[PDB]
From a paper:
Here, we report the discovery of potent boron-based compounds that inhibit an unprecedented target of Wolbachia, leucyl-tRNA synthetase (LeuRS), and demonstrate that inhibition of this microbiota target is an efficient approach to arrest the growth of its host. The editing site of LeuRS plays a key role to maintain fidelity in protein translation by hydrolyzing tRNALeu mischarged to noncognate amino acids such as norvaline. Altogether, these experiments show that benzoxaborole inhibitors of Wolbachia LeuRS are prodrugs that, in an enzyme-independent manner, form adducts with adenosine substrates. The adducts then bind with potent nanomolar affinity into the Wolbachia LeuRS editing site and efficiently compete with the physiological substrate norvaline.
To unveil the structural details of the inhibition mechanism of Wolbachia LeuRS by these compounds, we performed crystallization trials with the protein in the presence and absence of inhibitors and AMP. The architecture of Wolbachia LeuRS consists of six antiparallel β strands that form an extended β sheet with four inserted α helices, hence adopting a β1-β2-β3-α1-α2-β4-β5-β6-α3-α4 fold. (B) Crystal structure of Wolbachia LeuRS D1 editing domain shown in cartoon representation with key secondary elements colored as in (A). In addition, the region 313 to 318, which, as judged by the high crystallographic B factors, is highly flexible in the apo-structure, becomes more compact in the complex and makes interactions to the adduct. The new high-resolution crystal structures presented reveal idiosyncratic features at the drug binding pocket, which rationalize the selectivity of these Wolbachia inhibitors.
Residue numbers in the entry: 221 to 266, 271 to 277, 287 to 394
Write the structure that this text describes.
């Protein structure tokens, strides 16, 4: 559904990777990036392990837009190309798809969503973000609103439904 496209700088090549996500507030808990096999970046400047033969590390990282931190870029068979761009960032702590990836390839787990008691959680007092620098202390809905403004003001991302 409605989401946002984020432009990641790749340390390896001149082309920048553009991922689509429905949960931009979890960007600070990102452990890695990953693309499908049929992605332009794969065939452009990179194959024996990919074509013949879970995911494979490209050898290059991507610069995290809001942290002095690099994330490993992967090419996995589980990644779906059809849905939008076919490129995503993995949040192990709040996604079982991304966790099983991080568990196998020893990628770090960073939780960023402090969940509240269930009776009060979803009604109004949405879970509190943390480990997210400026997003700390505010709710998920407020985090998703603010983080999009940071992406748009700095030319990093734009709204896409």
């Amino acid at each position: 559904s409605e989401g946002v496209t984020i432009e990641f700088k790749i340390v390896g090549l001149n082309k920048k990777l553009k991922v689509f996500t429905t949960c931009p507030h979890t960007l600070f808990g990102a452990s890695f990036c990953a693309v499908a096999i049929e992605h332009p970046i794969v065939q452009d400047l990179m194959q024996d392990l990919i074509s013949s033969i879970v995911g494979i590390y490209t050898g290059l990282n991507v610069k995290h837009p809001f942290l002095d931190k690099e994330l490993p870029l992967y090419v996995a068979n589980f990644v779906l190309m059809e849905y939008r761009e076919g490129a995503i960032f993995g949040c192990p702590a709040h996604d079982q798809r991304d966790f099983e990836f991080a568990q196998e390839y020893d990628l770090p787990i960073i939780p960023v969503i402090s969940s509240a008691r269930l009776g009060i959680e979803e009604y109004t007092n949405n879970s509190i973000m943390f480990n997210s620098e400026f997003l700390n202390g505010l709710t998920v809905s407020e985090a998703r609103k603010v983080i999009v403004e940071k992406l748009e003001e700095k030319g990093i991302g734009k709204k896409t439904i």
